[PDB]
Design a protein around this ligand. Sequence first.
Ligand SMILES: Nc1ncnc2c1ncn2[C@@H]1O[C@H](COP(=O)(O)OP(=O)(O)OP(O)(O)=S)[C@@H](O)[C@H]1O
Ligand SMILES: [Cl-]
Ligand SMILES: [Mg+2]
Length: 271
Amino acid sequence: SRAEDYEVLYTIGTGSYGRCQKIRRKSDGKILVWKELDYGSMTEAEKQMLVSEVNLLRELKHPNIVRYYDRIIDRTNTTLYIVMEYCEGGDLASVITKGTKERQYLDEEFVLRVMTQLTLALKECHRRSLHRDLKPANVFLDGKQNVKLGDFGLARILNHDTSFAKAFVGTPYYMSPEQMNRMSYNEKSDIWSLGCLLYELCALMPPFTAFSQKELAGKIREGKFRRIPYRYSDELNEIITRMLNLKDYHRPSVEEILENPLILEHHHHHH
Ligand SMILES: Nc1ncnc2c1ncn2[C@@H]1O[C@H](COP(=O)(O)OP(=O)(O)OP(O)(O)=S)[C@@H](O)[C@H]1O
Ligand SMILES: [Cl-]
Ligand SMILES: [Mg+2]
């Protein structure tokens, strides 16, 4: 409700659309974050749509989705603050970067935790069909081995210049063949993207790489990639390989994934 209700501790990071800061809620000393967004250049139309997105965001209550908490406006700076759950383990990009630097592969048990809890996150997103971009940077870890989807697509609308540069410069490593060939909404497309993510978690590189977009498109089109490292079981390799099937209808559904014998209770969330 009010900015005075919170005490900024420090800046965790400057995103493309503003700062993310670690904050303490005064009422109870609860540690949270907020996302600092300047809406000064927005039209009335863009702000109502922003309001719409926030309302849908607050409507997501799931252990495996970064939890929404509050909205605060300081009109003096034309700054909107979105209070979110603090995820102490950081994002998966950093984890993958750390794995490369230290020359160490991630435990299969970890990959199974992400697989399980991210699939559950997806099942929830689909039920409510909404931003579900599954890049490692959009995936967070708390302090209890819980995995949370935190795609803050919301913020694109604030600066169209930065949003255009992000869309044009960036390489869609996780782009499904359907979505490349002029497609739209299909939940099997999200399964392919999850496959890419789990693959990158295992191999520390995405399944398809190129220096060019049309070279990347050729690679994806062919649907060939290296097997994930041999430290990972044939079972985990078969499931990931399955999510990366050229045909969306050959990819496993959320339900089919969760039926896999690899996935056990301890792989799910515990708060
Ligand atoms: N809920 C959260 N809990 C803890 N840390 C977070 C949370 N959200 C973001 N971070 C971290 O804060 C830093 C800033 O990133 P963000 O501004 O959230 O997004 P960004 O990737 O920089 O920009 P985007 O994706 O366009 S919103 C990153 O290092 C994140 O790992
Ligand atoms: Cl290595
Ligand atoms: Mg982000």
